Amino acid sequence: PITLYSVSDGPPSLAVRQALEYLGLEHKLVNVDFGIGEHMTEEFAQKNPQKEIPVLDDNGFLLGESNAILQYLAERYGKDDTIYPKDPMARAVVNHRLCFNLSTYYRYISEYTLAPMFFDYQRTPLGLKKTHIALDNFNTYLKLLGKKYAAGETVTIADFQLVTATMCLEAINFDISPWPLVENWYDTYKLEHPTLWKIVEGGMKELEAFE
Template identity: 65%
Template sequence: MKLYSVSDGPPSLAVRMTLKALNIPFELVDVIFNNGEHLTEEYAKLNPQKEIPVLDDDGFLLSESIAIMQYLCDKYAPDSPLYPKDPKQRALVNHRLCFNGMFYYASIGAHCLAPMFFDYERTPMGLKKLNIALATFEEYLKRLGTKYAAGDNLTIGDFPLMTATLCLEAIDFSLDEYPLIKNWYETFKNENPDLWAIAEGGMKELAHFEKNPPDLSAMTHPIHPIRKVNK
């Protein structure tokens, strides 16, 4: 099994945490984002979307981090509480996965990561959308009243929410206005140090790029405008 991954990418980090939590051996293949390795025609053979990560399980190629995490649980740990079988419990986990991908991480990525790597600005509207996303997650935690995002035990629903939230730590964004998120975030760190070690590595890279913008001038991106870095 191979995982094509970028070292600071939240979706890649979430998949790596899943593999670690399930004790699945794999080969980590680093895709150098800043060099545009994911934009090559060779990489497109793995994933026509040219996005990261991609799982290669003995020739079975699968992209999209949520689908990868679900597949790993279904195939290699069907009885794991990380992805419960009970329909209502699984529905909550699936909701958290979808909520993150379509709403939470989308707002965080636009505010934190896009200006870090590309020619986008942090705007009042982007900040407003970010706070709406945080307030929504805070409300979900309040309504459920459990330790983790989808219950009292850790699930794969927590992993992408965690790797999205670490982007906020990387830019020194305070979670003081969202005490339930802050408590959930710190609980994850304290109770899962081996998983946090994976996430923390990515967070520290992002924190470095926040203060030292990467030079992407050699990359031609088909969608995002490249930010010029003064040398």
């Protein structure tokens, strides 16, 4: 079987869960922030030095880092390659956007939105400026590629990540209308993939309560 160790309102976990839903993959979900889930990772803590969540357990194969989990699930499962194309150039655009999310978009958004929620970290003007730069960059990338989704004309695993990062801004009532291509993309995602957005919305609601 497949088991996902996850944080119920963690954007990386929510990215992986959208992929599992899109691919129709049965799995056990362990929310490590829910009740006894805290201890349900003890069976493999020496194996994740980073205290790594999410972690995917595919029939004994343990894999961390949400980007790598998504790249693995999409290559190994599914009837076609549309969410992670095999063509090297098409794939490179997906891989680029996944790197952009990890290094820049979700890096700066998460530091401004979530870190102050759950830590003694402070929101600052500099953190706000970096959030604006990340949104500028994403708006420009959408304009440059010229397609409906972040790495193609249809959804890919890059969108699964970028959506959960953008949701962090919504969770704190951050107005994204200054980035019209990002706003249009986000609304289009929700309209065309309601069962995927539904997963992310459940996490958003938890975050709004503890904003």
